[PDB]
Design a binder for these strands. Structure first.
Ligand SMILES: Nc1nc2c(ncn2[C@@H]2O[C@H](COP(=O)(O)OP(=O)(O)O)[C@@H](O)[C@H]2O)c(=O)[nH]1
Ligand SMILES: [Ca+2]
Ligand SMILES: [Ca+2]
Ligand SMILES: [Ca+2]
Ligand SMILES: [Ca+2]
Ligand SMILES: [Ca+2]
Ligand SMILES: [Ca+2]
Ligand SMILES: [Ca+2]
Ligand SMILES: [Ca+2]
Ligand SMILES: [Ca+2]
Length: 903
DNA sequence: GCGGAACTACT
DNA sequence: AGTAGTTCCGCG
């Protein structure tokens, strides 16, 4: 079909691009690309080229890129603007693919790899690569195979080959539980020497050069390690062969006692999945280990193996290798579920950029606006720098800490991109300034109307209402494109059902899969043929209908992610269209809006319930307001409600038929007041929360800004079977807290909201004793010792020493003169427990090796002096009180039943 | 490292 | 205790 690119690169004066041919073959190309730039000219030399300001420009075509750059520097001294796209890779993509790109991921080579490197001393530093690579599994998507390169005769031991027959059996037999559907997709290659092994790994890499490279943290470890290693042994010029163009660029970094290398390989796109998972996940994981995330996303357990990690190879090789493969596999399962690489390509090919530039909102948007502008003979402004300096932020109401029974919230749609469209804020729409009053004067409609000819903002800017802005025109385009892909998706997910129903009655015969476009609901003619098709054809059509559905879905998650990252570009000094005054016009507007709708709602609810000065808005998000329906319920006794599911119904209607309308009216009166281009502030109710009918629960509470808990029944229309707990900033998932205390802290919240003060106390008492009876290692902690030697002063903790190092020294002191005891080594991993004051160890804590169990040398004292109380009060009662105090409760009664017996 | 949450440590 | 100063994630 139409060809698409794989990678674009600027190597001096030529562009090096890898692409897919019109006949589907992968091809490479070199092009001494000849760029163009622009310069302003007089109103008599004008042609067809204009900047966003309307002033004419003349084109300048250079012989090569070096000249073009050279001409920009030169143009700088003269003091004249150099308009035009200065990143020549994007201009070349815009010229070579002047049409919507339609790609076929099935022709794109995506590589996923992980390596293993045995280390006696500390964690192997990549920038040094002193330790040999004894394993390396490479999964190629084109071939759908797991290529395992297993070493066999290292300076750290020699071993037996891996056995696939074993690998698939139950561990309870010696097997490694390697998934079934993976066993036949493995190609095991055993080697007798590293240098050998390594060379083969390169022939492999040239014969199957990745286009996209993934793994779990391959960017800050695996890649630099493989690079430096090969370098060390064969030379940087036979290491640069990991680059299809023999060009690399090594960047170095280091802070105090940490240092790293990130080797950018020319001609190949690196999308580290961890880096990727942290961006599109939108879920803060308290940890990002392959192990933790794999559990979260796959409810799969941390593969077991005993002994210290640094010797798992000479100890047990079989399992050593099997856990290398499993891990590469766990990463595919996460992608097969999150589909993040697939989202990368889509967004990448949409903006026409290098796929990795997806991590940068600046590049992506810069390309979109450029391409949009170029198709109109428009010339982009030259990027000039400006001093970084903050401006007002998001208004966040300081809530009065307390309990809140009935609460329903309202959110306004895509607030910021929406302001940019309402006020018409863009760099070339600025039209003036006005004498500005205090912000309070504006939220209260006390100040004078700024203008009757221009669109304004509370900060003092005015914009042109007669012309569309470059930025706002672009936002609207992307917004309308989502609606388009929604439809395609729904129609494909709909044509999908039709096809399945057909499959219930396959026609015994031989036919073909119909030639139809799945983005559109099938015609009656098609539907009628479906019923007669065979099972082969039909099953095919289901694939293709299913393919089309996912495609339209990713397309819209894309336009959605895009729109949300725009404000991030417009506020960044390095964005080509940045302007401090505009960035501030958006932020000051958003503030005013929120506090204006606040006054209005407080106005409308006090009138409707017949009262005065009452405050119904208890808290304000940056784009949300939380209202307490307390009186709105008291207005109806709360004894006239059948079940709880009844009042949820009632409030649901009271917000749609009365709340919403009074809100829309208010946002329009503000649109005129500020005289804006188009009214776009849409604030719809989203959540309904409170305590189960006829219960003692409190409903919810706020401790402070961004810290609250709500018992939610309905969210934007969908009624929950079981109420859901919404927890924000109460830190109930600290990595520092024992898993059992995380579950207990969440339990006290549910009981406070759904059951009540009484029910709370009962439970605090319960967890109290059950916690004091937990195994030690249960409540222990982990961290590693990677700078103990320094912190060590004559055997004791030196100044500013870290807790775990204190333990690693305390342990270190009780083991002097013993050889059976597991020693702690620089870089290893350890366990830490707080010791009770007065212990035989002489310090407040102690640590020990995580790879083996506590020496019988100290075990008994450790168990006897473990400081349960300090942990219990530090991780469970200190935070618990924050909730209770603010909510006006007590997790323990001071006076109980016994003080009736006059003992 | 990055960027930074997220932990000590001090006037 | 706010405000200021450190560790350090993820990788064997
Ligand atoms: N319009 C436009 N072109 C740019 C800018 N920067 C570099 N160019 C280059 O301008 C040329 C585009 O002109 P083109 O559309 O082919 O002109 P025409 O087709 O002869 O009218 C290409 O070499 C672009 O890469 C820019 O900011 N705006
Ligand atoms: Ca790894
Ligand atoms: Ca590993
Ligand atoms: Ca990284
Ligand atoms: Ca049939
Ligand atoms: Ca919100
Ligand atoms: Ca208006
Ligand atoms: Ca909504
Ligand atoms: Ca101190
Ligand atoms: Ca220091």
């Amino acid at each position: 079909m139409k060809e698409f690119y794989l990678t674009v690169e600027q190597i001096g004066d030529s562009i090096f691009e890898r692409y897919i041919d019109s006949n589907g073959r992968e091809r490479t190309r070199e092009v001494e690309y000849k760029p163009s730039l622009f310069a302003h000219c007089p109103e008599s030399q004008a042609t067809k080229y204009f900047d966003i300001y309307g002033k004419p420009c003349t084109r300048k075509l250079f012989a090569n890129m070096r000249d073009a750059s050279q001409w920009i520097k030169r143009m700088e001294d003269i003091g004249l603007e150099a308009l035009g796209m200065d990143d020549f890779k994007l201009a070349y993509l815009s010229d070579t693919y002047n049409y919507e790109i339609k790609y076929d991921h099935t022709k794109i080579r995506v590589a996923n790899f992980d390596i293993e490197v045995t280390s006696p001393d500390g964690f192997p530093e990549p920038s040094q690569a002193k330790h040999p690579i004894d394993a390396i599994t490479h999964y190629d998507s084109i071939d759908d195979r797991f290529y395992v390169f297993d070493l066999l005769n290292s300076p750290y031991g020699n071993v037996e080959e891996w056995s696939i027959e074993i690998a698939a059996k139950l561990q309870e037999q010696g097997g490694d539980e390697v998934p079934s559907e993976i066993i036949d997709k493995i190609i095991y290659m055993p080697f007798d020497n590293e240098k050998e092994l390594l060379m083969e790994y390169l022939n492999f890499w040239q014969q199957k050069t990745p286009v996209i490279l993934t793994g779990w943290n391959v960017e800050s470890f695996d890649i630099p390690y493989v690079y430096n290693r090969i370098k060390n042994i064969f030379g940087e010029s036979t290491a640069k062969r990991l680059s299809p163009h023999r060009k690399t660029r090594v960047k170095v970094i280091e802070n105090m006692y940490g240092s790293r290398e990130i080797i950018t390989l020319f001609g190949i796109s690196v999308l580290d999945y961890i880096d990727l998972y942290k961006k599109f996940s939108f879920t803060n994981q308290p940890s990002y280990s392959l192990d933790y995330i794999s559990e979260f996303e796959l409810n799969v357990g941390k593969l077991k193996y005993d002994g210290p990690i640094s010797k798992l190879r000479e100890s047990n090789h079989q399992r050593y290798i099997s856990y290398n493969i499993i891990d590469v596999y766990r990463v595919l399962q996460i992608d097969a579920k999150r589909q993040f690489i697939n989202l990368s390509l889509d967004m990448g090919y949409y903006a026409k950029i290098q796929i990795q530039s997806v991590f940068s909102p600046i590049k992506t948007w810069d390309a979109i606006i450029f391409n949009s502008l170029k198709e109109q003979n428009k010339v982009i402004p030259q990027g000039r720098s400006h001093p970084v300096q903050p401006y007002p932020g998001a208004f966040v109401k300081e809530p009065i800490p307390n309990r809140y029974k009935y609460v329903m919230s309202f959110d306004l749609t895509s607030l910021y991109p929406s302001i940019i469209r309402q006020v018409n804020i863009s760099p070339e729409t600025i039209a003036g300034t006005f004498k500005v009053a205090p912000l309070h004067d504006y939220i209260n409609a006390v100040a004078e109307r700024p203008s009757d000819v221009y669109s304004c903002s509370p900060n003092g800017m005015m914009y042109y209402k007669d012309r569309d802005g470059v930025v706002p025109t672009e936002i609207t385009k992307v917004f309308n494109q989502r609606k388009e892909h929604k439809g395609y998706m729904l129609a494909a997910q709909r044509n999908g059902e039709i096809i399945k129903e057909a499959l219930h009655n396959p026609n015994l015969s031989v036919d073909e899969p119909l030639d139809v476009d799945y983005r559109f609901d099938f015609s009656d003619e098609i539907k009628e043929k479906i019923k007669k098709l065979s099972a082969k054809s039909l099953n095919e059509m289901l694939f293709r209908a299913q393919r089309t559905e996912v495609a339209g879905m990713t397309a819209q998650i894309n336009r959605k992610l895009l729109i949300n990252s725009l404000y991030g570009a417009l506020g960044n000094v390095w964005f080509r269209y940045y302007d401090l005054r505009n960035a501030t016009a958006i932020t000051t507007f958003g503030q005013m809006a929120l506090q204006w709708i606040e006054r209005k709602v407080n106005e409308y609810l006090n009138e409707v319930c017949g009262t005065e000065g009452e405050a119904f808005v208890l808290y304000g998000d940056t784009d949300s307001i939380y209202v307490s329906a307390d009186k709105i319920i008291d207005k109806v006794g709360e004894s006239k409600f059948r079940d709880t599911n009844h009042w949820v119904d009632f409030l649901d209607k009271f917000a749609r038929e009365r709340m919403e309308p009074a809100i829309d009216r208010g946002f329009r009166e503000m649109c005129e007041y500020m005289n804006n281009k188009q009214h776009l502030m849409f604030m719809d109710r989203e959540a309904i929360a409170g305590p189960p009918l006829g219960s003692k629960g409190i409903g919810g509470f706020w401790t402070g800004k961004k810290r609250y808990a709500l018992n939610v029944w309905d969210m934007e229309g969908t009624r929950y079977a079981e109420p859901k707990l919404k927890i924000m900033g109460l830190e109930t998932q600290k990595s520092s807290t024992p898993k059992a205390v995380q579950k207990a802290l969440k339990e006290c919240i549910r009981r406070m909201l759904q059951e009540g003060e009484e029910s709370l106390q009962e439970y605090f008492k319960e967890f109290e004793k059950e916690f004091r009876q937990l195994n030690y290692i249960s409540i222990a902690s982990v961290s590693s010792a990677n700078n103990i030697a320094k912190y060590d002063v004559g055997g004791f903790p030196g100044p500013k020493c870290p807790f775990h190092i204190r333990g690693i020294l305390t342990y270190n002191r009780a083991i002097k003169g013993n050889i059976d005891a597991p020693q702690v080594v620089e870089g290893e991993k350890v366990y830490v427990l707080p010791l009770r004051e007065g212990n035989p160890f002489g310090d407040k804590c102690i640590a020990w090796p995580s790879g083996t169990e506590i020496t019988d040398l100290i075990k008994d004292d450790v168990l006897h002096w473990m400081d349960y109380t300090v942990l219990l009060e530090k991780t469970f009662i200190k935070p618990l009180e924050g909730f209770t105090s603010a909510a006006k409760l007590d997790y323990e009664k001071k006076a109980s039943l016994f003080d009736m017996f006059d003992f």
